[PDB]
Amino acid sequence: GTRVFKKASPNGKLTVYLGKRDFVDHIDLVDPVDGVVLVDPEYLKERRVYVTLTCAFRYGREDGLTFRKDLFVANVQSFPPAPKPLTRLQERLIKKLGEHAYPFTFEIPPNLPCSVTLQPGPKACGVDYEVKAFLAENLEEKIHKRNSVRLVIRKVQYAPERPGPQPTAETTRQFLMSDKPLHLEASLDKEIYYHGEPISVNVHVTNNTNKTVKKIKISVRQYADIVLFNTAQYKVPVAMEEADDTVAPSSTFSKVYTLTPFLANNREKRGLALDGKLKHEDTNLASSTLLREGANREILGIIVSYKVKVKLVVSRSSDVAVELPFTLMHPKPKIVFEDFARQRL
Numbered sequence: 001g002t003r004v005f006k007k008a009s010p011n012g013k014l015t016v017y018l019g020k021r022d023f024v025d026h027i028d029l030v031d032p033v034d035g036v037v038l039v040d041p042e043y044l045k046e047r048r049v050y051v052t053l054t055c056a057f058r059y060g061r062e063d064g065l066t067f068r069k070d071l072f073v074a075n076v077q078s079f080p081p082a083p084k085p086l087t088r089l090q091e092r093l094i095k096k097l098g099e100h101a102y103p104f105t106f107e108i109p110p111n112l113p114c115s116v117t118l119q120p121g122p123k124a125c126g127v128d129y130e131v132k133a134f135l136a137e138n139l140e141e142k143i144h145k146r147n148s149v150r151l152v153i154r155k156v157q158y159a160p161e162r163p164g165p166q167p168t169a170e171t172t173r174q175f176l177m178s179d180k181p182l183h184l185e186a187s188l189d190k191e192i193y194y195h196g197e198p199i200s201v202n203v204h205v206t207n208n209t210n211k212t213v214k215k216i217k218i219s220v221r222q223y224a225d226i227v228l229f230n231t232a233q234y235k236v237p238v239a240m241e242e243a244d245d246t247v248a249p250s251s252t253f254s255k256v257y258t259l260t261p262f263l264a265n266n267r268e269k270r271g272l273a274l275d276g277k278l279k280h281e282d283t284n285l286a287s288s289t290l291l292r293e294g295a296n297r298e299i300l301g302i303i304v305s306y307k308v309k310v311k312l313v314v315s316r317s318s319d320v321a322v323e324l325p326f327t328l329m330h331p332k333p334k335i336v337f338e339d340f341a342r343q344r345l
Helices: 088-097
Strands: 003-008 014-018 022-025 033-039 048-059 067-079 101-106 116-119 125-136 148-157 170-174 182-188 192-194 199-207 213-226 232-243 251-259 272-274 302-314 318-329 336-339
Touching: 003 148, 014 125, 014 148, 033 048, 033 067, 033 088, 033 125, 048 101, 067 101, 067 125, 088 101, 116 302, 125 302, 170 318, 182 302, 182 318, 199 213, 199 302, 213 251, 213 272, 232 251, 232 272
Parallel strands: 003 336, 022 148, 192 318
Antiparallel strands: 003 014, 014 033, 033 101, 048 067, 048 125, 116 125, 116 272, 125 148, 170 182, 182 199, 199 251, 213 232, 213 302, 302 318
8 A cells, every 4th residue: 555664763663654765856846755653651651752854965975974064954853742734644553553652844945955965986965854753861872872863854955847948059160171161050959857757859960061970978977066065176978979960061960869877877987976875776876966046056965967979070179169058957756564774785
């Protein structure tokens, strides 16, 4: 039936239940983090149960950190209940789990960065979301690790396909020791693409020169800018098609090329922004960072964007190129207990 993900604290006395691992950001709002926390009463002994949701930017090795910045923290006291309406899943889970199952809910602000991990090779950085449930007498009391449970949830970006005009074409005019120019014009089929979806690139060349285009290189490039702790810029090709298609002198050429950027091909590449850990199978290339008008760019930690590049290799050699921006999003999303740990393949 309904899949519910759970994780227990090391001692087994505190257990957290969530409906999903990935909470979709719909730009306007984010899926609520609706969960339940079960507690052992003999072990409770008149202690409070807290649940914390943290969004943090981290920089440095996973394995005392080098850098960590909390971008958002939300705390809720689940036991005793604090002076909110429950969801279908929470109501269904309390009935099944019993009188010691207490609800927790967080509303993730939409302006926060989506989950992103940047692998720089043999160091790392990223934005992570963590649900932490723990039992204690107050927030000021230092927590015992066996009395706490940590679940790494993700915020993933989804945007609906653009209802409007076609994506604008990119052009370039270049003179190649010539009286008249070579005109390169390219366009993409859509503005928004999802992970695993092919990208079609409509290439148009009006070569009014006496030179010949010997080949056409089509590629998808990821651009990842680190904007916290250590300002840096990465550029990684994530898809490449080298076509041996020529454009004769004084001639017009037109062709549609299709490419699909896949993480599977770029596991070895460095400076690559992913939407999760490389070890987890549900990880894809990072989605494009949506920049709202007047938003603080710095507090997003890592800014990801994509472009398709169309390069014409000319004989003499020389290069004529255009770059086409596009948005890469997470695909449209979609009682038995399951472990929260994400699978590797």
